[PDB]
Every structure is written in C-alpha cells, then in structure tokens.
C-alpha cells in the first residue's frame, strides 16, 4: 500500500521513448519536491532526477522529469537495453513526516514479442492435508515482459495473509516464469467453497479456481 | 573516493538485536544529512530514518519506533542504526544515503540544499531467521481436469521447507527431459525455501505412463523419489 502510485511496469522498443507516472496527494507530491531513482538489477538505487526536474552530473539529458499538481512523470527517450531497471519516485510527506516511495516500475526494453502467461493452479494434496498443512500452488510461465501481478481470493474476497510470490526470472526459452503460494490450515481450506489465483499481465487477466470438493 | 560502506548486518534470530554502521569517506560527513533505507528482495524501497548533520533532528517510519534508533558520530565519519527486537518483517538489504548539504558561502552566510538521496552505499544484508540445514518435504501435484487442457496435462512435485539452496529435480531419473519446468524457489519469511517442479505430458498417457520426480538436496544429504499419479 504505497503512499505514491506507480504502474508496476512499462515497456518500449530500443530507440523509443517511455514515460513513468507517479501519483500522490497534496501532502506529498502536491507540495514537496520529487526525486527519481534508477535501480539496475542487484545494485543500489542511483539518483536520476531531484527537485522535480534537475539532473545530477553524469545523468544524460535522455532522462527528464516534470510535474503537474499531485502527479509527476519521468521521461526516458532513446531507450537502450542498459536502461532496463526498476524506477522509483520519492518525496517527503508532510502529514506523515516521512520519506515516501512509490512501489517501483519495471522498465523493459523489448527484445522479443510480448507473450501471455500460462497459469496452472494446484490444490493441496490429500497427503499434505494429512501433515496438517495446505498449500495452493499457482504456476505462471512463458510470459514477457517479466512482470505480473498476482491476487488470491477466497469465495471472491481478497486474501493477503499467507501469500508468498517469487520474482519472475528467465527460462531457457528466454521468457519468464514465476510462482505464488497460498498457505492455509486444513480447516480454512475446507471451510470455503472456492479459492482463486488471479494473474494480471500487461492488461490481461487470467483467473484459475480450485475447490476442496474436487 | 566518495563512498558509503554499510556493515554490521548478517543473520540473527527473531527478538535479537543488531547495530548497523555506515562509514563515510571522500567528503565532509559532518556537513550532511543522512538516511537509512531498506529493501526486501523483490520488493520496493522502504525509507527507515533520517538524521540532521549535527545529530539533533531525527525522523523514522512508525513501524520501527521503540525498536530502531538512528544516530551518528561525526568524529568517526559514521552513521548508525541500532535495531532491537528484530522480526522477520525487518529482513532486507539496508542502505545508507547522503542528502542535505550544509555549508557557509564565501561571505560567511549559512546555506543548505536538499539533493534527495544523492549518494548511496552498496547495502548490507540483514536476515532475521532461525533457519538451518533442513531437507524438504515432497508432495505430489496430481494431474487433474484443472491442470489439463485438451491433450496436454501438467503434473508435478511440491518441494517444501528446505534450507539452504539448492535443490535439483529430475524426472524418471533424467530420462524425461521434454516439458520439464523446475521453478525458482520462493524464500519464505521463516527463511526456508520451497519450489515446484512441473512436467507437461500427454493427457492420454496419464493412465499408462509412470512419472517419478527425483528430488536431490545435497546440503542435508537427502534424496526423495515420488511417483505422481491422478487422484482417486
């Protein structure tokens, strides 16, 4: 539940330009200076933009920042594969008296056609129920870009407790895979009629369902 | 040689404490405001705390109050984070970062400028976990109507609660290679790992062909073979 809202991912082809928006309220972006950070895989974040639209030395003019009301935008032109990174906006929040970050945006520089994920959802095995445990396993494969959002539901209601989801990573065929697991007790598994794994990828959503009665 | 180097991290058990250090070099440390920021693997940046150049002004996120204290020793170019009563939710890489410059201009006037987090350290890993060597519990992921679509059915093995990495998985002793997808492990909040390995096979072969996952975990010297079949 980040105070600032970024899209989880954006993409474009090499040479093209992209924007990343960050949205907040009057207590943060509306009345405080925004900075942007780039985080290459495995590294610490690097400052891209400060004071809404200034670049530190060594940051090329391909990167730019702008502001309108309670939103800010990072622009990147002339996309290179080296720009692939997670991008974060940050500012001070006057109501919290705290630094607040957006949730991050993964930037993919398209190196292949976009691909939809295949989703498979397995219920707990009877053997596992005999061990007094219950794991629902949602498997997600063959997708690109490498970003998905996973949401679980019990009889249509959101469930957040007991969810563990991996970071997507490359398969041998150069698409991505991820998995999400929902941990329940045998009792809470048997007491609902339906559990669902909902996977969102580039605007499209696939939802799979299982039930104890199967 | 402008540099921030974090240290003092490592593995600790829940409830214990840890003291992080951030050594500053290549600039006048005592002229700058400083932050701590953390990041759990695969998650977003989470700000922890800030402290003024002189040490008198501090702010921190609500969730660490009463437990974490930011301080600094300007004589030793060092920023500290005392972390008591650690929980699994505090597992993360911890970074320090430099922000506000305070200076006197050539006429002797006091000036300052916020730059955001303009210089970052390389981070230090903090792991709040009692995990130690443990072999996995292996459960079948049975093929069914729900794991099937037309002539293609998926089945697999759930490999639960092991430490440390890695686990390797083969099927029918490595004779079955096509359609084998072994997924990257999830690192749980307990510090144990789990993974799944799935194979896609012909739906028509489910009654006939036997499928066995071979799970190898060298750190615990455990091996498991498990036949995976449809459930009655």
């Amino acid at each position: 539940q980040s105070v600032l809202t970024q899209p989880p991912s954006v993409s474009a082809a090499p040479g093209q330009k992209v924007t990343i928006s960050c949205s907040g309220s009057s207590s943060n972006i509306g009345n405080n200076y925004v900075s942007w950070y780039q985080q290459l895989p495995g590294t610490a974040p690097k400052l891209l933009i400060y004071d809404n639209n200034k670049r530190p030395s060594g940051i090329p003019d391909r990167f730019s920042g702008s502001k309108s009301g309670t939103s800010t935008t990072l622009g990147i032109t002339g996309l290179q594969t080296g720009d692939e990174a997670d991008y974060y906006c940050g500012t001070w929040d006057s109501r919290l008296s705290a630094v607040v970050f957006g949730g991050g945006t993964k930037l993919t520089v398209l190196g292949q056609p976009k691909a939809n994920p295949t989703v498979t959802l397995f219920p707990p095995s009877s053997e596992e129920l005999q061990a007094n445990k219950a794991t629902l396993v949602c498997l997600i494969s063959d997708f690109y870009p490498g970003a998905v959002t996973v949401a679980w539901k019990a009889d249509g209601s959101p469930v957040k407790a007991g969810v563990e989801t991996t970071k997507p990573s490359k398969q041998s065929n150069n698409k991505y895979a991820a998995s999400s697991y929902l941990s329940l007790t045998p009792e809470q598994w048997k007491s609902h009629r339906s559990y669902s794994c909902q996977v969102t990828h580039e605007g499209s959503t696939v939802e799979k369902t299982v039930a104890p009665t199967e | 040689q402008v540099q921030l180097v974090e240290s003092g991290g490592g593995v600790v058990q829940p409830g214990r404490s840890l003291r992080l250090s951030c050594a500053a070099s290549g600039f006048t440390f005592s002229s700058f405001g400083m932050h701590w920021v953390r990041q759990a693997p695969g998650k977003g940046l989470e700000w922890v705390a800030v402290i003024s150049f002189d040490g008198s002004i501090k702010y921190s996120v609500d969730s660490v109050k009463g437990r974490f204290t930011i301080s600094r020793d300007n004589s030793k170019n060092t920023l500290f984070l005392q972390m008591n009563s650690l929980r699994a939710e505090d597992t993360a890489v911890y970074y320090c970062a430099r922000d506000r410059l305070n200076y006197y201009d050539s006429s002797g006037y006091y000036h300052y400028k916020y730059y955001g987090m303009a210089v970052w350290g390389q981070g230090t890993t903090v792991t709040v976990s009692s995990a130690s060597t443990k072999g996995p519990s292996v459960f079948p992921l049975a093929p069914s109507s729900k794991s099937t679509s037309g002539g293609t059915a998926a089945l697999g093995c759930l490999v639960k609660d092991y430490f440390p990495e890695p686990v390797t998985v083969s099927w029918n002793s490595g004779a079955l290679t096509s359609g084998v997808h072994t997924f990257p492990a999830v690192l749980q909040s307990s510090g144990l790992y789990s993974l799944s390995s799935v194979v896609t096979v012909p739906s028509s072969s489910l009654g006939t062909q036997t499928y066995i996952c071979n799970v190898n975990h060298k750190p615990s010297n455990t091996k498991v073979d498990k036949k995976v079949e449809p459930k009655s």
Side-chain angles (χ1 to χ4, degrees):
Chain A
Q1 333 125 40
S2 302
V3 173
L4 314 178
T5 298
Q6 302 177 232
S9 86
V10 288
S11 67
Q16 301 299 280
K17 74 187 88 145
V18 76
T19 65
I20 300 171
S21 79
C22 174
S23 183
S25 76
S26 74
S27 66
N28 40 66
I29 287 168
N31 284 288
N32 292 96
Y33 295 103
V34 169
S35 48
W36 286 91
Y37 303 86
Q38 175 189 65
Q39 189 176 35
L40 304 159
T43 71
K46 182 194 311 184
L47 177 70
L48 278 187
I49 297 291
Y50 68 104
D51 282 355
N52 304 321
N53 60 21
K54 320 297 178 202
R55 287 179 281 101
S57 322
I59 296 324
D61 61 15
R62 299 194 295 108
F63 299 87
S64 70
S66 56
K67 178 133 153 178
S68 198
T70 58
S71 282
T72 50
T73 301
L74 178 74
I76 320 179
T77 59
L79 278 167
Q80 301 162 19
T81 52
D83 300 330
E84 284 197 326
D86 296 333
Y87 290 85
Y88 293 92
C89 53
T91 195
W92 182 255
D93 188 287
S94 316
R95 192 179 55 78
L96 296 165
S97 295
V99 176
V100 295
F101 288 109
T105 301
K106 182 187 177 76
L107 164 60
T108 300
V109 173
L110 298 173
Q112 64 188 103
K114 256 119 166 286
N116 314 321
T118 298
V119 180
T120 313
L121 172 68
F122 286 102
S125 62
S126 57
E127 293 198 43
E128 194 191 7
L129 297 176
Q130 292 294 133
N132 203 32
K133 285 163 196 181
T135 309
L136 284 66
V137 187
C138 192
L139 302 173
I140 310 159
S141 64
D142 292 335
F143 60 96
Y144 185 83
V148 289
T149 303
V150 183
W152 290 84
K153 293 179 208 114
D155 294 336
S157 283
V159 40
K160 300 243 129 227
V163 171
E164 304 268 41
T165 300
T166 62
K167 261 264 276 173
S169 61
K170 282 275 186 59
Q171 313 161 158
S172 53
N173 74 358
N174 250 286
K175 291 167 187 174
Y176 285 80
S179 48
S180 186
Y181 296 86
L182 176 52
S183 292
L184 303 168
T185 70
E187 287 67 39
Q188 65 199 157
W189 163 243
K190 283 182 186 303
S191 67
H192 293 104
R193 314 229 287 156
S194 186
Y195 278 88
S196 295
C197 186
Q198 188 193 69
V199 181
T200 298
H201 179 261
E202 309 283 312
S204 311
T205 303
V206 182
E207 181 172 85
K208 294 296 184 72
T209 295
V210 285
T213 43
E214 299 176 314
Chain B
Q1 224 279 250
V2 172
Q3 169 172 44
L4 300 166
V5 200
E6 302 87 343
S7 51
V11 179
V12 277
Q13 297 197 311
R16 304 300 185 286
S17 74
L18 218 52
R19 181 187 180 75
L20 306 183
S21 289
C22 167
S25 55
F27 64 94
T28 310
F29 177 69
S30 65
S31 300
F32 288 93
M34 299 288 305
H35 301 264
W36 286 101
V37 174
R38 75 186 174 185
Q39 188 177 44
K43 314 291 192 183
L45 298 176
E46 174 175 40
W47 172 81
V48 178
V50 64
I51 189 168
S52 60
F53 73 101
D54 57 2
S56 68
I57 290 161
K58 310 176 184 205
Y59 297 90
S60 66
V61 71
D62 255 29
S63 63
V64 308
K65 280 176 181 166
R67 298 191 307 113
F68 287 19
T69 306
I70 193 175
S71 70
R72 64 145 101 214
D73 186 348
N74 283 346
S75 76
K76 312 204 170 207
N77 280 35
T78 304
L79 172 76
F80 299 105
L81 190 70
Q82 182 60 47
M83 302 179 292
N84 304 329
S85 180
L86 282 159
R87 311 146 176 176
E89 72 165 336
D90 302 313
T91 294
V93 177
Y94 284 73
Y95 299 105
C96 56
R98 193 192 77 183
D99 181 7
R100 174 168 155 168
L101 167 69
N102 303 267
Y103 68 100
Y104 288 93
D105 70 20
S106 62
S107 288
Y109 293 106
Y110 173 59
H111 282 290
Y112 56 99
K113 180 160 178 49
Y114 288 99
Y115 285 103
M117 291 153 204
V119 184
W120 292 71
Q122 52 181 283
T124 189
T125 293
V126 175
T127 294
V128 194
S129 170
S130 301
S132 74
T133 313
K134 191 197 168 282
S137 297
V138 179
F139 296 101
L141 296 166
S144 79
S145 153
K146 294 237 157 174
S147 84
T148 299
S149 193
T152 310
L155 51 90
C157 279
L158 172 59
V159 182
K160 286 180 70 180
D161 293 335
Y162 65 90
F163 183 90
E165 290 269 56
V167 155
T168 64
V169 189
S170 71
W171 286 87
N172 294 353
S173 309
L176 181 62
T177 59
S178 312
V180 172
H181 287 160
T182 293
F183 287 76
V186 73
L187 174 54
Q188 307 168 213
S189 61
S190 69
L192 304 177
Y193 296 84
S194 298
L195 66 72
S196 303
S197 175
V198 166
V199 277
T200 61
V201 309
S203 286
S204 60
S205 79
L206 288 181
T208 323
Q209 257 288 149
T210 88
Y211 298 104
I212 305 173
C213 69
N214 322 110
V215 176
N216 239 73
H217 187 240
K218 188 59 176 59
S220 70
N221 296 113
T222 314
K223 194 201 180 224
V224 188
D225 303 311
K226 183 89 197 179
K227 191 200 191 116
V228 188
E229 55 187 26
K231 192 51 157 62
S232 63

